Curated annotation (Swiss-Prot):
Top-rank lineage group of the source organism: Eukaryota
Homology family: In the C-terminal section; belongs to the peptidyl-alpha-hydroxyglycine alpha-amidating lyase family. In the N-terminal section; belongs to the copper type II ascorbate-dependent monooxygenase family.
Primary role: Bifunctional enzyme that catalyzes amidation of the C-terminus of proteins. Alpha-amidation is present at the C-terminus of many endocrine hormones and neuropeptides and is required for their activity. C-terminal amidation also takes place in response to protein fragmentation triggered by oxidative stress, promoting degradation of amidated protein fragments by the proteasome. Alpha-amidation involves two sequential reactions, both of which are catalyzed by separate catalytic domains of the enzyme.
Disulfide bonds: 2-136, 36-81, 69-86, 177-284, 243-265
Protein name in the entry: Peptidylglycine alpha-amidating monooxygenase
Effect of residue 127 to A: Impaired Cu(2+)-binding
Assembly description: Monomer. Interacts with RASSF9.
Documented effect of changing residue 62 to A: Impaired Cu(2+)-binding
Annotated Cu(2+) 2 binding sites: 192, 194, 264
Positions contributing to Cu(2+) 1 binding: 62-63, 127
Localization: Cytoplasmic vesicle, Secretory vesicle membrane
Residue segments, region Peptidylglycine alpha-hydroxylating monooxygenase: 1-304
Amino acid sequence: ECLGTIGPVTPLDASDFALDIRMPGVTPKESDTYFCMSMRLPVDEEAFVIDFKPRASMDTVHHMLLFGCNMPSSTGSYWFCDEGTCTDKANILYAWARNAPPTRLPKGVGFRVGGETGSKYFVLQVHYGDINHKDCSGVSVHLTRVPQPLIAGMYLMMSVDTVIPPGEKVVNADISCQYKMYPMHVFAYRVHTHHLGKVVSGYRVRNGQWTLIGRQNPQLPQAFYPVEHPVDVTFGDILAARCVFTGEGRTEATHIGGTSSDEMCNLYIMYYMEAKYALSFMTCTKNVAPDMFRTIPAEANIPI
Ligand SMILES: [Cu+2]
Ligand code: NI
């Protein structure tokens, strides 16, 4: 339901509050419309996101994403996300998929927001699949001023230079970076691709030995799925991902971009670190060890 007079901030206690990020009573007119809206944080000082609660209209809402960033793409009430999510790098915090119920954040793990360096805005993306009434669906977020012993963060792996020729059977997108930070522990993962993607898989390679982080079919509902067994990545380790693509069906060559006729090989690894060692976001857009992919487990090429 639409919040009305009470407003979006509910105090939970002296140092906690719930912030309701909602659609401002939207009415979609087409199938597969993507709406976005932002919420400046209510506190300027640092705070930690410790919990999320979905408030989705189960009929119309396909998936919801929740980002943190400093420059949302529009200064408006809401907008079509084709205009963009954020001008600066948008950090994903939460993915709600229809047919894949999200996993809770471990206790003591939180995303740092606000303050001098955290995210100053939340941006809510709601995808309306099937469609007069006004929709107020969104997420309810649990913020705390209390410093958390473990800090949540995102290691993002994405391809930039992949080129898929038309009708081509199999095209591999290889991403690889060496980890040069304090240890992190992977606890969830999301895969994102468009319609040409067949399988995505991320690994930790340590002394030539591949440890699976996540292996998923990008056509299946793109939520964050929990890691089978939590995995430490440590200074020296190499993170490695592959997306497997097809060109079959396409008439012209497909590159990396933002439209449906474009592609993307995106593995979001969610992790926690020790608060005093923690950093909040890492990105790999390179393939530093290409010849290493000769020993990639065979599972990464077969479709799930
Ligand atoms: Cu995309
Ligand atoms: Ni460990």
